[PDB]
C-alpha cells in the first residue's frame, strides 16, 4: 500500500539502512513493500524480510510474556481490575496482526512462486514459524488448527530439505532447530524434539568435511544452537 510509489531497489536500499539504524518496524514495512512489487526475492532479500519481521515479532513476544506472567500472578491475589488483561490483549492482537501480515505475504504469493529448494524451504519454514508464534498465544477453539498449520508447513519444508539440501545446509539446519522447538513446547512432544535435534546434529557433523572454512563456520553456528537446546532438554 503505502510503499506503492517507491522503487523496488529504493525499498531494498532503505531496508538495509533501517537494519543498520535498528529501525526494524521501518525495515519490515520497506520489505513488505518490496514483496508487494510482485517479483521473487533473492537470498539476501529473503533474509532482509525475515530479519525485519523476526525483530518486530520478537519485541511483541517478549512484551506478551511479561504481561501474561503479570496476568497469571494476578489470578493466583488482590483484584486490580481489567487493565492487565486488556493490555495483554492489546499486545496480543498486535502480535497476531504481524503474524497475519507475514503469512499473507507468504500466501500472496511468495510460496507459490518459490521453486528452488533454498527459497521454498525458507518460506515454508517462515510459515511454520509465524503459525508457531500464533500458537504461543492461542487459547481458543482454533489452537489445534493453528498448531497443525505450523506442523504442516514445517513438515513440507523438512521433506524438501531432506531431498534437496545437504545435511549441513544452514537453511535446513535452522528449519530443523525450529521444528524441534515446535515439537518440544508447542506439540508437547519432547521426545520427538530431542530425536530431531540429535539426528540433525549428528548428520551435519558427518558432512562438515565437505565444506569450506566459511561454510563450516555457518553450519557449526547453528549446530551449536541444537546442542544448546539438547543440553537443556537432556
Amino acid at each position: 500500500g503505502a510503499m506503492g510509489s517507491m522503487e523496488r531497489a529504493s525499498l531494498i536500499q532503505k531496508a538495509k539502512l533501517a537494519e543498520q539504524a535498528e529501525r526494524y518496524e521501518d525495515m519490515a514495512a520497506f520489505m513488505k513493500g518490496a514483496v508487494e512489487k510482485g517479483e521473487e526475492l533473492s537470498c539476501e532479500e529473503r533474509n532482509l524480510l525475515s530479519v525485519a519481521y523476526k525483530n518486530v515479532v520478537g519485541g511483541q513476544r517478549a512484551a506478551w510474556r511479561v504481561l501474561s506472567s503479570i496476568e497469571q500472578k494476578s489470578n493466583e491475589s488482590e483484584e486490580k481490575g481489567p487493565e492487565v488483561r486488556e493490555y495483554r490483549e492489546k499486545v496480543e492482537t498486535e502480535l497476531q496482526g504481524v503474524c497475519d501480515t507475514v503469512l499473507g505475504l507468504l500466501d500472496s504469493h511468495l510460496i507459490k512462486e518459490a521453486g528452488d529448494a533454498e527459497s521454498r524451504v525458507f518460506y515454508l519454514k517462515m510459515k511454520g514459524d509465524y503459525y508457531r508464534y500464533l500458537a504461543e498465544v492461542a487459547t481458543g477453539d482454533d489452537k489445534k488448527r493453528i498448531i497443525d498449520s505450523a506442523r504442516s508447513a514445517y513438515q513440507e519444508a523438512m521433506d524438501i530439505s531432506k531431498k534437496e539440501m545437504p545435511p549441513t545446509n544452514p537453511i535446513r539446519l535452522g528449519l530443523a532447530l525450529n521444528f524441534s522447538v515446535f515439537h518440544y513446547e508447542i506439540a508437547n512432544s519432547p521426545e520427538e524434539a530431542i530425536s530431531l535435534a540429535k539426528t540433525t546434529f549428528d548428520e551435519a557433523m558427518a558432512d562438515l568435511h565437505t565444506l569450506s572454512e566459511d561454510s563450516y563456520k555457518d553450519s557449526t553456528l547453528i549446530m551449536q544452537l541444537l546442542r544448546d537446546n539438547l543440553t537443556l532438554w537432556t
Binding site: V51, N55, R61, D129, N178, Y184, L225, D228, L232
Partner: peptide, 12 residues
Amino acid sequence: KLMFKTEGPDSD
C-alpha cells in the same frame, strides 16, 4: 519463561 534457541535474531 525459559525460551529455547531458535533460528535468527534473538529479538525476544
